[PDB]
Amino acid sequence: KVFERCELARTLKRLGMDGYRGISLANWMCLAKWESGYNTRATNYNAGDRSTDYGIFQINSRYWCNDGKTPGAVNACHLSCSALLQDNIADAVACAKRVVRDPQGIRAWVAWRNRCQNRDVRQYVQGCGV
Ligand SMILES: [Cl-]
Ligand SMILES: [Cl-]
Ligand SMILES: [Cl-]
């Protein structure tokens, strides 16, 4: 599914994302907008390294989830990558929390550095009741 902005924002707040390891809700919103345009079924194959990025946060199969088809991969989220293609994003959120427990935090996503870091991301949550 393709979330609407404010419904997403409340969905993520319910799932404990606001201020998770120091990360405001707006940053997560910015990350989701730029990774997938709020589309849980979004995928991107990386021909270069044989990995795939899954779902609304575009979580990569090499490190985080299992798809069976990525060399030398580990599954730190302990999930099938299919869990990251669901309408219900709880599993994707749990995995995203796990990504940011590692030592880069949100910096693990390059789209966040490009499109979010040291920018004014207030607009993402404006009007949403969060
Ligand atoms: Cl911030
Ligand atoms: Cl699973
Ligand atoms: Cl679902």
From Swiss-Prot:
Q: Which disease is it linked to?
A: Amyloidosis, hereditary systemic 5: A form of hereditary systemic amyloidosis, a disorder characterized by amyloid deposition in multiple tissues resulting in a wide clinical spectrum. AMYLD5 primarily affects the viscera, and the predominant clinical features are renal dysfunction of varying severity, and intra-abdominal bleeding. Inheritance is autosomal dominant.
**What Gene Ontology molecular function terms does this protein carry?**
identical protein binding; lysozyme activity
Where does it primarily localize? secreted
Query: Which keywords describe this protein according to UniProt?
Result: Amyloid, Amyloidosis, Antimicrobial, Bacteriolytic enzyme, Disease variant, Disulfide bond, Glycosidase, Hydrolase, Secreted, Signal
Please describe the quaternary structure of this protein: Monomer.
What name does UniProt use for this protein? Lysozyme C
Q: Where in the cell is it found?
A: Secreted
Additional detail: Lysozyme C is capable of both hydrolysis and transglycosylation; it also shows a slight esterase activity. It acts rapidly on both peptide-substituted and unsubstituted peptidoglycan, and slowly on chitin oligosaccharides.
EC top class named in words:
hydrolase
Transmembrane domains' residue ranges: none
Boundaries of each C-type lysozyme domain copy?
1-130
Disulphide bonds annotated for this chain are C6-C128, C30-C116, C65-C81, C77-C95
Q: Which PROSITE patterns match?
A: GLYCOSYL_HYDROL_F22_1, GLYCOSYL_HYDROL_F22_2
Q: Known PANTHER family for this protein?
A: LYSOZYME C
Physiological role = Lysozymes have primarily a bacteriolytic function; those in tissues and body fluids are associated with the monocyte-macrophage system and enhance the activity of immunoagents.
Active-site residues? E35, D53
InterPro entries noted in UniProt: Glyco_hydro_22, Glyco_hydro_22_CS, Glyco_hydro_22_lys, Lysozyme-like_dom_sf
Q: What Pfam families does UniProt report for this protein, alphabetically?
A: Lys
Enzyme Commission no: 3.2.1.17
The family assignment reads: Belongs to the glycosyl hydrolase 22 family.
Q: Name one GO cellular component term.
A: extracellular region
What's its catalytic activity? Answer: Hydrolysis of (1->4)-beta-linkages between N-acetylmuramic acid and N-acetyl-D-glucosamine residues in a peptidoglycan and between N-acetyl-D-glucosamine residues in chitodextrins
One GO biological process term: defense response to Gram-negative bacterium
